[PDB]
Amino acid sequence: YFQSNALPPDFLLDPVEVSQQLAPSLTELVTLLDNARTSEIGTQLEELSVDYIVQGLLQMGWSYQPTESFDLDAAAQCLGVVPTQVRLFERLLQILAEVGILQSNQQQWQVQKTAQKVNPSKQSQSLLSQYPDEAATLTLLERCASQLSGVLRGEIDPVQLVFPQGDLTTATQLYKDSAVAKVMNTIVEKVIMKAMEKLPPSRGIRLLEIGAGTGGTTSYILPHLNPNQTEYIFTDIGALFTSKAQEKFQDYRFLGYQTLDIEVDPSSQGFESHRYDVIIAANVLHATTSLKQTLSHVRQLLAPGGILVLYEATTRSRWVDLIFGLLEGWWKFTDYELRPDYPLLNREQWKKVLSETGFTQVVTLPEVEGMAEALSQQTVIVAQAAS
Ligand SMILES: Nc1ncnc2c1ncn2[C@@H]1O[C@H](CSCC[C@H](N)C(=O)O)[C@@H](O)[C@H]1O
């Protein structure tokens, strides 16, 4: 019965086979999400984001009257935006153009309407009373976006707003226990367990997670892994995250902890090449400079038939721009031919770039008719290392 463990993990199910067999599970898992309610919450968060932007710009002395025109550079110097925050500032201006306050003409901006009096803290509280299940999202958005002017002026390190040493759980709850993240993280767990269901007893499985953070996605996977034949490598670029995850996950003795910067050759950071069966990357790969070189490093870690499980957001979101868009990773991208002005890719763009970086049999999840629009704005992508 035993066959050499040195040979590639051919027992791994194809991603397409995995999605076919998970189809009845995914159909019922999607229905657990309120379609009408998740949409109206998301819509209101996008409107509240406009009020945070206007409040911050007025705090920096925005005095642009209607008809007046300005370019990005002049407005940044006027408001005092530091050079490292201009790309975020440009996106904020783009948001104001989407709602009709501004208009984009060539590389110029024209003020169409005078922004009215806003009080986003008061409206955030009203939404908190109506949707207490979104308290983590509202509280994080209030803590981050209410210091938008200080971040734009380089006076406040936005990592101390998103990921302060004393509160890493708030941002974790967004990645872990939000309505949409509950579904996506469950898909991540079901995919991984289904792909390895034919694991021979005489063989161990090696999983590596990139950008695992505090372990929001990780917590869904660990309880289902067989500790006797699993090695799970928990990695993040930052040791503060692996340190916090090591405390949370003490019960699991098959976990290893190590730092990994996916933008640099992993084999120079103490990782074996082509020796991991499953790589998990939840909400991280977008925060890199070049997706092709990031995906080539990801592919470099996968065994010849290994599985890449990707969890990414696929659409622009105003309130996300006021939280994780404050951080440097949101604006690292320079592959402008692929990503002209935003770090995220949609389903079709991910499939194309994966097929160009050595991945095959690419599946995007979930794909159910009658699906809530919120589930269309994020995806779990499963792809196989090709050769
Ligand atoms: N270049 C890089 N290589 C590896 N990890 C990176 C990275 N740039 C940012 N990261 C990490 O990616 C993480 C994104 S937080 C993503 C959510 C996380 N998977 C969870 O569920 O909790 C951050 O913790 C950050 O430290």
From TrEMBL:
Coiled-coil blocks: none
Signal peptide segment = none
Which residues take part in binding S-adenosyl-L-homocysteine?
A: 172, 214-217, 236, 261-263
Could you tell me what this protein is called? Answer: CurJ
Species of origin: Moorena producens 3L
Q: What is the lineage of its organism?
A: Bacteria, Bacillati, Cyanobacteriota, Cyanophyceae, Coleofasciculales
